Amino acid sequence: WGNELASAAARGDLEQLTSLLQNNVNVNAQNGFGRTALQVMKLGNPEIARRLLLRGANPDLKDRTGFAVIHDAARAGFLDTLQTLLENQADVNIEDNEGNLPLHLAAKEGHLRVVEFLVKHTASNVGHRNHKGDTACDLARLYGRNEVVSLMQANG
């Protein structure tokens, strides 16, 4: 179950995932490499995240590098999964090993809509400095994310 559930999530096979969920499974079981189905899930499949969360999947777990799924979602620009993560109590201000919040990663990669949602509709700490002293906006500025910077100073 744990392994197959993780496999179905990793591949983005909702049908197979929902099939497995009919069994008495621990959605927070770790696969062969220590990651849960939610952690290995292929982003771009918010329903898979929703089904896993509905069954009690812990959204705040961190991998080898202290990255939570919301970190991955934010960094890659997957707003839908990020939002379903939050509507299921995932911590928005969870930090990676360098003190970066999901907002930092979104800003750094120039995902304007993700940043906008975070700044405007979440408890994201816009003034949070990572370990090296940089805020999400600083990183946007450093990475030439002009539109993100303008949006951030426009409301925070």
UniProtKB/Swiss-Prot annotation:
Pfam families associated with the record: Ank_2 (PF12796), Ank_4 (PF13637)
InterPro entries: Ank_Repeat/CDKN_Inhibitor, Ankyrin_rpt, Ankyrin_rpt-contain_sf
Keywords: ANK repeat, Cell cycle, Repeat
GO biological process terms held by the UniProt record: negative regulation of cell growth; negative regulation of cell population proliferation; negative regulation of stem cell proliferation; oligodendrocyte differentiation; regulation of G1/S transition of mitotic cell cycle; stem cell proliferation
Coiled coil start-end: none
Function as written in the Swiss-Prot or TrEMBL entry: Interacts strongly with CDK6, weakly with CDK4. Inhibits cell growth and proliferation with a correlated dependence on endogenous retinoblastoma protein RB.
Gene Ontology MF terms: cyclin-dependent protein serine/threonine kinase inhibitor activity; protein kinase binding
Gene behind this protein: CDKN2C
Tissue specificity field: Highest levels found in skeletal muscle. Also found in pancreas and heart.
Name of the protein in its database record: Cyclin-dependent kinase 4 inhibitor C
Similarity section: Belongs to the CDKN2 cyclin-dependent kinase inhibitor family.
Cell cycle is among the record's keywords: yes
GO cellular-component term (any): nucleus
Subunit structure: Heterodimer of p18 with CDK6.
Effect noted on mutating residue 68 to P: In breast cancer; loss of CDK6 interaction
ANK repeats: 1-29, 33-61, 65-94, 98-128
SUPFAM superfamilies the record matches: Ankyrin repeat
